[PDB]
Design a binder for this molecule. Structure first.
Ligand SMILES: Nc1nc2c(ncn2[C@@H]2O[C@H](COP(=O)(O)OP(=O)(O)O)[C@@H](OP(=O)(O)OP(=O)(O)O)[C@H]2O)c(=O)[nH]1
Ligand SMILES: Nc1nc2c(ncn2[C@@H]2O[C@H](COP(=O)(O)OP(=O)(O)O)[C@@H](OP(=O)(O)OP(=O)(O)O)[C@H]2O)c(=O)[nH]1
Ligand SMILES: Nc1nc2c(ncn2[C@@H]2O[C@H](COP(=O)(O)OP(=O)(O)O)[C@@H](OP(=O)(O)OP(=O)(O)O)[C@H]2O)c(=O)[nH]1
Ligand SMILES: Nc1nc2c(ncn2[C@@H]2O[C@H](COP(=O)(O)OP(=O)(O)O)[C@@H](OP(=O)(O)OP(=O)(O)O)[C@H]2O)c(=O)[nH]1
Ligand SMILES: Nc1nc2c(ncn2[C@@H]2O[C@H](CO)[C@@H](O)[C@H]2O)c(=O)[nH]1
Ligand SMILES: Nc1nc2c(ncn2[C@@H]2O[C@H](CO)[C@@H](O)[C@H]2O)c(=O)[nH]1
Ligand SMILES: Nc1nc2c(ncn2[C@@H]2O[C@H](CO)[C@@H](O)[C@H]2O)c(=O)[nH]1
Ligand SMILES: Nc1nc2c(ncn2[C@@H]2O[C@H](CO)[C@@H](O)[C@H]2O)c(=O)[nH]1
Ligand SMILES: Nc1nc2c(ncn2[C@@H]2O[C@H](CO)[C@@H](O)[C@H]2O)c(=O)[nH]1
Ligand SMILES: Nc1nc2c(ncn2[C@@H]2O[C@H](CO)[C@@H](O)[C@H]2O)c(=O)[nH]1
Ligand SMILES: Nc1nc2c(ncn2[C@@H]2O[C@H](CO)[C@@H](O)[C@H]2O)c(=O)[nH]1
Ligand SMILES: Nc1nc2c(ncn2[C@@H]2O[C@H](CO)[C@@H](O)[C@H]2O)c(=O)[nH]1
Ligand SMILES: [K+]
Ligand SMILES: [K+]
Ligand SMILES: [K+]
Ligand SMILES: [K+]
Ligand SMILES: [K+]
Ligand SMILES: [K+]
Ligand SMILES: [Mg+2]
Ligand SMILES: [Mg+2]
Ligand SMILES: [Mg+2]
Lengths: 435, 428, 408, 421
């Protein structure tokens, strides 16, 4: 029942749901299908508000950071916002919670979320709000119970632009590795993680559970995906993250600042290319520069672009933009391919939410990767396969999609979407509304 | 931040978001505020499964009904479904929960639901599921706590497409009149009820709270909306329902059979017309016949159709198809107007979907009036933003969407219009 | 030999001048610290005059440490006439001052080597002093020199008589008293009324206008027919913070209004014959004036020439979502586009009396909506480049032969 | 901030404004010498031509008093129709900047005191904006006047009143300006001067710098008569100094002796590295050198000619004989698209654009496939002919030999819908 990733005209027909006539005389009586995506996150609740730069330093914060805070310092901040009646919005959050939420909206298929949740949920609470607000098709039944509160992210915006985060973890890192459902990760087409998962008070089991999901991920050949949580967290130990990506990660989500922190390259293109030594596919959100994508394709199946060749540190880096991504392991003679797209319709008027924008362009990519798993099980004999790809569409096309989604997330306050993209009406549908 | 009702090319520009530059020169120093819709329901959870028509009779059920059952009968049925591993789908339900859910998906604005909810919610439970599944923009913060379980609706399919429903109410009818948020209903553009709300064990407060919600609705001149839950519920006392509609209800949703039970008219058009004696606007879903709509417009502002004139018991009833609906009270020379549309693309809970579309159009008028009071769309105090012909176009398309899927709840709105610039972008 | 205004496909066939007054200026650009501004008694966002010796002190600090980045011709009306000639490929006459003896490498030298070719400077007036120096600090610091010494005898009556518009800036009355520039300006306006030449006015900062808003209003009624403006300059003139309303209130005094609303886009308001109304095919927009673009598609007339005048409005948003990163010279560019369209009407009427585009005494060649389209595009061009002066017109679409020729 | 040469769809992306966010994350002009001249155009009788010792189709110097008599009769009878800046190289530097929207430096003379309304004033108000005249030299005399005398037939006779136009001194040649250039442009008229005037000496000092810093030298011709006086000296000039030769069909027959344009250009290729000849209505030919390893063969039919199938490798980029390791001779010709004097002066500007474009794209895009070797032109000979042919067509549909309207660029898919909105 999954939607098509993007709005481009496709050469091959996409079924959308298995009840399709041609597909019904086609599929077997016993049909599995049902392709999904799973991620791990620190169950969080955003509490957004604008504040003075005085409010920032008064609580030991720095602009543009994501800093954890002590429990007593947080209650002091919580009380000052209710006193001054400064709170503007309360909604679900989490770099990966947002991503799973946006995935379900874009594809209208299920996503499983792994994390924590109050064992007893009272109405009107932060844990309650998290549920009423989470997307419908996002599945929260596999969460784990905790006797404490879920996490609170005090998103402080201040003057136009930089959005500061202050985290009251609560029990958000109390996820145990026994709570990782083996069967869910096996039938997944990607496992999505964020750099914030290692940031925890020592001894908390979240990292223990995260590595356990990766165990299952490797068992069943499920790509591991990683998004990053600010430049400062990474620059502390760049070589540790580098070593981590080689062993486990297969897909890397990133922005230009987070990337230079990892590679030492002020050029996103080079940072992304240097990253390809460690992972199979890289997405780099460069803010106003646009976004880049770098990955691998089979050298025999390369498709050369029809756009002008772009200049860059790597000459003509989009030369095979129209190739689809494969995992390095699945290639016989892997070839590096790169692509870049500029902001949609010249970008927004207002800078707005640049933090959750990257977390959204990622969801677009996940959609395309799931779509490949979905269309492969429903139409296996298709020209779209018998080569073992990673993405259903080409890098150029996936950029086209993810770029359009980021524009959606930037042009609104929240980082979570509630409405998918508008698809084209055919002639019949068009005349219907015009009649 | 509300979406536009339908996908038609509009003469007047719809702001969509109160942040629109053209609207901030227009907008005062303080927020202009969006509108919303509220409804009351028996918090329910659908539990779908196929069974024999033999299985139906084994629990005192009839094909095609919606029947309550006692707790011992319910625990036996639940155990038999888990035993044979027969359950196929579990999701949120309720005639009005669905409608409020679909409204939020279609409009992308907030909807308030009033009802019950376990005060202690354990993970994996039914009360848990209700939350994880309800749409985001549907607001459940105003539900009421209960020491019991929410309702379970066992949807049983009879192989021919027949849907039998077996209801284990639990505490779903325990909504108290104090729990009705007065301020929520005041800023609403409609209060939505379902005929199922009167079905409860004696002494339970649900009816008391219902009368209390309607009380607030009249305070602030909020239209009351009523959808019906089967012909059988109405045939019990059709003249009682008639009396209810005159006093309270302003908008009536129905299907052809539900209507015949209420008015005695096997012709939907005639039944709807008779219904207009009691309410201000009528939506009647006639299945494969299509769906009809009947309402009032000011005889001064009538806009005559440009489509061919249709034959029916009411001669040339679509003559003013293109008029907008008003409430009878707001009209000085009220005029009856009718419209009819056939199924989308020849045909393949649907009625509860076409209603949601109507709610959207009514909220859109409330939204566009607060953001652009100067526009030609408000020389008078209308009920719908669009014309009956246009509202039917929308509701018909939505019911088709609910038919082509299994569940009665939508998960994604309709495909929106792609302009020329977007097209070139994707085709690049 | 004039170009077509815009790149839109035209129903009527185009076969293929304007005069203005300015304080002859030369831009000298440099970026500086916010400390540098207060160190010389300046304020941000102004155009503040400075003395000749104080000007020499600022000039010298820029030469020592070499902070000057770019030097080019300037002046709100110098830019506008310059950009007009680039866009239309027709002549524009500029009136002002100029060193009577010009040495190679000088500032007066540069102004000539840099001014557009098709722009005609022969009617300038000689002065034994220097032209003006504008020190652009990223605020403007002005060393007037002799820029305001234009004498009214130097106003060529015959030039303005055969013109289709006279273009002025509010900066022409801002001068040390006793300098003759304002007198020369009034003489041009006197000539303009004789031969029925529309008067055009762009404004030079909110501060200049807010001092005595009620006076400028009266100026526009008597003389002005076309008003160029930005959103701030507009609130100062009318007291209406809404650009739509401000532009509307200004229509009480003038015949046509162009208001650059920065990121909001740009508005336009004018008059058209109620018989010749052409109603828009775009959605009706909301605003303080309901459905104000209802007749976006009418052509512009002067209030006097209408028998049943009707007010008509249009609004368009920034091109391609605005730029990536010079919000000043843009308005001075958007204006040039309007001039281009107005010249085209007098041009297309004099070369093609048989065409249907002259059924009435029009002001604009195109529709109000179509003109906004054109001016909007030019503003984007002025924003993407550094200087406020254009160097190449817009690219026009070629036929199939050009397509096939270049690809072959 | 330079424009792209031509309107063809390019395989490689052209940065245009060096701001372009692309090249910035990993982060060029042409100079010429001319006799400062002013065109004064007018229609005249065939009696008017002979009356001052002139012949139709020449560019003839005249005495100062012979000029004063001619000037006075044109004002008396009110015969002058247009007055504008001129000079075979003045046109070129002007037209280049119009087409490329980048700077061009011009070297010459100019009144040290310029009064309003004068000819020196007019020259500046009229010169292209982006043309830089700051490096000119001051002179205590009047600038040159070229009286363009046209007849009803169309013959454009030229009468030159040199004044001090040939007083350019070799010290006034800016050493560094020519160094960072991509071409040094000269005209056959620079050696033609009254004896003792230093103008030819200044030319040789500019050429010194050109070879010093490896700047290709360019040469355009005036009329066939200018060369037929001494064809063998011009030839000898080309070998040592010139790297690029500009020519038209008649000017060429006088230098090479070939009534066939193709052979003449080929003969000239022995002395210089690249030759362009304007063949009037026959079209235009181009000949040069390319690396034999990277030659790219045409997709057009092979043409018959004095050299059979001369367009066999039309699509190659041109190199200098010196820069080639194994040079190959390459030829191309294009016919007219869809003022016979100034049109050729325009096509030269077009080629300069492409040659600078290579210099511009090389400094901004060192990594591209377009700079493996050390090329001369950015585009292919077939593509370069397209451009210059297109420019010459514009020069004919207008009066003056200087342009005011560069080429109109192709409207995009996105833009076109905007203008259609
Ligand atoms: N315009 C455009 N096209 C893209 C882009 N990315 C990939 N393509 C094209 O899609 C074609 C492959 O179609 P599929 O990807 O197999 O089918 P799909 O329509 O379901 O995606 C490729 O062409 P091909 O098969 O090599 O050539 P052909 O056989 O389609 O002629 C490739 O050139 C893009 O960003 N823009
Ligand atoms: N095609 C079509 N049109 C419909 C339908 N229902 C109403 N209309 C037309 O819409 C017009 C009114 O526009 P509004 O309702 O005020 O604007 P809106 O479309 O943006 O809401 C009416 O025309 P009017 O105002 O009388 O004529 P005009 O002023 O629109 O020219 C009416 O004829 C329908 O089902 N199909
Ligand atoms: N594309 C476009 N068109 C606009 C715009 N504004 C006005 N028009 C249309 O231009 C037409 C008038 O054309 P002119 O303005 O005379 O011709 P032009 O193209 O040379 O300017 C009008 O209708 P018409 O029916 O085309 O004229 P007619 O054929 O009835 O005379 C009007 O609808 C705009 O922004 N974009
Ligand atoms: N249509 C056309 N093409 C010309 C002409 N002259 C040269 N070319 C083509 O230009 C290509 C080289 O492109 P570049 O010069 O590097 O790129 P450019 O488009 O930016 O100039 C050559 O093709 P290639 O790369 O070998 O061909 P392909 O593999 O791109 O098909 C050659 O065929 C001409 O007159 N007409
Ligand atoms: N998982 C996680 N998400 C975070 C953290 N800090 C901020 N975010 C989320 O990041 C998003 C903004 O980029 C919001 O959804 C925040 O709630 C953190 O420490 N962990
Ligand atoms: N992604 C990626 N994997 C590599 C690269 N070089 C070696 N490997 C992997 O390292 C292991 C050693 O062969 C195998 O799993 C390879 O696929 C590289 O450049 N990129
Ligand atoms: N409120 C309410 N909804 C019901 C009842 N019986 C069935 N439904 C719902 O009606 C929908 C099908 O029309 C499903 O969501 C059912 O759960 C009932 O008694 N009350
Ligand atoms: N709905 C409805 N109310 C009516 C009608 N005729 C009179 N009324 C009542 O008359 C009053 C005037 O609006 C209200 O009480 C209405 O309900 C009718 O045809 N329909
Ligand atoms: N006429 C005039 N132009 C000015 C003044 N101040 C700045 N400018 C010019 O206005 C342009 C920027 O809008 C630049 O060319 C400035 O040099 C002034 O007082 N008068
Ligand atoms: N611009 C303009 N002139 C007006 C308006 N109303 C009257 N006038 C003129 O003002 C003078 C006094 O009525 C006459 O010249 C009128 O034509 C108006 O709304 N706008
Ligand atoms: N430098 C120079 N230009 C000339 C001469 N004769 C004609 N021209 C110019 O050549 C152009 C016509 O080809 C016009 O601009 C003429 O002024 C001459 O002797 N020297
Ligand atoms: N341009 C050119 N130079 C040649 C040729 N043959 C020899 N040379 C000269 O020989 C030297 C080697 O490059 C240089 O001085 C060249 O100019 C030839 O065919 N063309
Ligand atoms: K890896
Ligand atoms: K939910
Ligand atoms: K009623
Ligand atoms: K100039
Ligand atoms: K006036
Ligand atoms: K040589
Ligand atoms: Mg991030
Ligand atoms: Mg201005
Ligand atoms: Mg020549």
């Amino acid at each position: 029942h999954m939607k098509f990733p993007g709005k481009r005209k496709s050469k091959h027909y996409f079924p959308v749901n298995a009840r399709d006539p041609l597909l019904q005389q086609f599929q077997p009586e016993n049909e599995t299908s049902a392709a999904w995506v799973v991620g791990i996150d620190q169950t969080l609740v955003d509490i957004e508000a604008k504040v003075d730069d005085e409010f920032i330093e008064r609580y030991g914060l720095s602009a543009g950071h994501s800093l954890v805070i002590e429990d007593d310092v947080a209650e002091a901040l919580y009380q000052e916002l209710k006193q001054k009646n400064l709170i503007t919005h309360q909604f679900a959050g989490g770099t990966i919670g947002n991503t799973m939420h946006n995935y379900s909206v874009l594809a209208d298929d299920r996503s499983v979320l792994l994390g924590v949740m109050c064992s007893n949920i009272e109405i009107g609470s932060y844990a309650y709000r998290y549920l009423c607000n989470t997307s419908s098709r996002t599945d929260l039944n596999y969460l784990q119970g905790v006797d404490g509160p879920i996490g609170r992210c005090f998103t402080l915006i201040g003057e136009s632009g930089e959005r500061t985060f202050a985290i009251s973890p609560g029990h958000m890192n109390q996820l145990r590795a026994e709570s990782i459902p083996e069967d869910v990760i096996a039938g997944a087409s990607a496992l999505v993680l964020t750099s914030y998962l290692v940031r925890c008070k020592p001894g908390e089991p979240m990292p223990e559970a995260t590595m356990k999901a990766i165990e299952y991920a490797k068992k069943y050949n499920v790509p591991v995906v990683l998004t990053l949580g600010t430049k400062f967290v990474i620059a502390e130990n760049p070589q540790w993250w580098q070593q981590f990506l080689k062993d486990h990660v297969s897909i890397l989500a990133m922005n230009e600042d987070e990337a230079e922190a990892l590679t030492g390259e002020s050029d996103p293109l080079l940072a992304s290319d240097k990253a390809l030594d460690w992972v199979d596919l890289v997405l780099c959100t460069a803010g106003p520069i646009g976004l880049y994508m770098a990955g691998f394709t089979e050298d025999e199946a390369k498709r050369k672009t029809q756009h002008p060749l772009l200049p860059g540190a790597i000459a003509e880096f989009n030369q095979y933009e129209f190739s689809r991504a494969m995992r390095h392991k699945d290639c016989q003679n892997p070839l590096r391919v790169y692509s870049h797209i500029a902001p949609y319709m010249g970008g927004p008027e207002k800078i707005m939410n640049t933090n959750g924008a990257g977390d959204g362009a990622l969801a677009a990519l996940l959609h395309d990767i799931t779509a490949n798993s979905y269309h492969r099980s429903n139409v296996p004999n298709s020209s779209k396969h018998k080569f073992t790809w990673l993405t259903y569409s080409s890098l150029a096309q996936v950029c086209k999609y993810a770029n359009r989604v980021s524009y959606q997330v930037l042009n609104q306050h929240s980082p979570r979407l509630t409405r998918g993209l508008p698809e084209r009406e055919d002639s019949l549908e068009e005349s219907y509304w015009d009649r």
